[PDB]
Amino acid sequence: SSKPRILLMGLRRSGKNSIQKVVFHKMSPNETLFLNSSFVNFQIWEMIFRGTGALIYVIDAQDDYMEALTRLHITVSKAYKVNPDMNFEVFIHKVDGLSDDHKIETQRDIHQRANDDLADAGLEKLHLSFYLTSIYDHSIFEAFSKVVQKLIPQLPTLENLLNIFISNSGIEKAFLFDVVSKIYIATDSSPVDMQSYELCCDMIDVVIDVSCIYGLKEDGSGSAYDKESMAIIKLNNTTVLYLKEVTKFLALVCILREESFERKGLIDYNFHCFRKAIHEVFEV
């Protein structure tokens, strides 16, 4: 029940419903043209700003943003008054319709004025972070992963547990994922290749979608993801992807070589120490 709390905001047609649909109700981007199950407590949108961790203001960059930029300044100016520990996030959204010249121009511009408008009100000590997002890209997932990692006080502990696990288990990279959202709340200390994240997100999709079709039990339904959810994917360059259930919200996805995976037994035994430790972290 003590999840991180995020509020999405933005003018109509900015793309809020489209972001919500794609990330948290696991639905395709194209079908958003007609519109309790995650580690994250998220809501579209002064008691509300009291107990929230982060506000994501969205902007349509296929559209003029002058009006957009002004509600932004006012919306954040308000929130800061009530709770100045809140983090302020800005989804320069719909950049899949631009060319790269126009994306960089637009970001330089929105970043410039947004930060100018904050100087004028003497709100010096109010950080804005910016992001280029798209329901048609993985940018929305990376942006949410970055937003959520800021609200987990236990992240140093999580990064350390993954480091001990992978270093002792022959593993190149580990991602602690929120399964519905495909957001990563932690990874080991090795640098993150966003192509690696993206492939791991696409693995979660195949595992969950194949699970939703098979083994739901003989009645209409049980649950696709349970304590025995596991997958092994072999790629022709001898890469192995390995997903194991950690909690009802958390799956572990591991990248390693067939050569380390020869030692699955050790991986499997160390995994159960890592899983218990993660249970202790979150008093589950």
Partner: protein, 300 residues
């Protein structure tokens, strides 16, 4: 000495013929089809499917000007030797009557030149209609298409590049063109029963079209074959782009296990199990061994 089979892909400009062909046979994603140029006259494609079948795909530009040549100076070249006509319709067309007039004029040429052609009608871009309207609008378009198809039979599907309905339709089309397809089905029902699987799907390797299946206990999702095609095809494209080629997958729940692996040089297999007293080794040894017994068949 592989069966060569002529497929006319026809319909008006922008209806989405080249998009379909590009997603099924050429590893495009829906988003990429935005960048396709109008086809000029016919774009010829040779698809090696399983080594016993070759698909001679005729992608015909549907510019009025191109159509008129097909109906006259190119009439014999186009409409002779046709196994299949796949005719595409834009659900969103403003020219329904003009659309039907170009369809019926193709049906005539097909009646006069290749009158045993299997005819398919694809009611396409269904993603542009509201969900609660799609079944309604397709049934009506279907009813008209079957009636206006005169003495010829037609099989209709509602398709979109943005979901699994496109694999439903192209699976059905290709299924009817695989030579000894009834044999394949028996050989796989055999294999399935020996290995005591709830379900086995067999896929052509490059397209991930379902080419055979076998189910034990009747399942609830009758659309699940196209969904699996789509889910796996997508993931196979994320692999090659982001890392390297998909080889194999093992997935499990407290209620099931599935195994997706290369089968023959030209196929993938998926095996669904609900964990009786089956040591995982027994199943993998069966998959491994049954290869040689399917590795024959598609010779020439």
């Amino acid at each position: 000495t592989a069966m060569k089979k002529k497929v006319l892909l026809m319909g008006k400009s922008g209806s989405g013929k080249t998009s379909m062909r590009s997603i099924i046979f050429a590893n495009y994603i829906a988003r990429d089809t935005r960048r396709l140029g109008a086809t000029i006259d016919v774009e010829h494609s040779h698809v090696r499917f399983l080594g016993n079948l070759v698909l001679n795909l005729w992608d015909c530009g549907g510019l009025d000007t191109f159509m008129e040549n097909y109906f006259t100076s190119q009439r014999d070249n186009i409409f002779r030797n046709v196994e299949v006509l796949i005719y595409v319709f834009d659900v969103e067309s403003r020219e329904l009557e003009k659309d039907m007039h170009y369809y019926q004029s193709c049906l005539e040429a097909i009646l006069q030149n290749s009158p045993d052609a299997k005819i398919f009608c694809l009611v396409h871009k269904m993603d542009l209609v509201q969900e609660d309207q799609r079944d309604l609008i397709f049934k009506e378009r279907e009813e008209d298409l079957r009636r206006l198809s005169r003495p010829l039979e037609c099989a209709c599907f509602r398709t979109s590049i943005w979901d699994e309905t496109l694999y439903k339709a192209w699976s059905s089309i290709v299924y009817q063109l695989i030579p000894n397809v009834q044999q394949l089905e028996m050989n796989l029902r055999n294999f399935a029963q020996i290995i005591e699987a709830d379900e086995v799907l067999l896929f052509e390797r490059a397209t991930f079209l379902v080419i055979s299946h076998y189910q034990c206990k009747e399942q609830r999702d009758v659309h699940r074959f196209e969904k699996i095609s789509n889910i796996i095809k997508q993931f196979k494209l994320s692999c090659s782009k982001l890392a390297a080629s998909f080889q194999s997958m093992e997935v499990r729940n407290s209620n099931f296990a599935a195994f997706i692996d290369i089968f023959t040089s030209n196929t993938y297999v998926m095996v669904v199990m609900s964990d009786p007293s089956i040591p995982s080794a027994a199943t993998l040894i069966n998959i491994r061994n049954a290869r040689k017994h399917f590795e024959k068949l598609e010779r020439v």
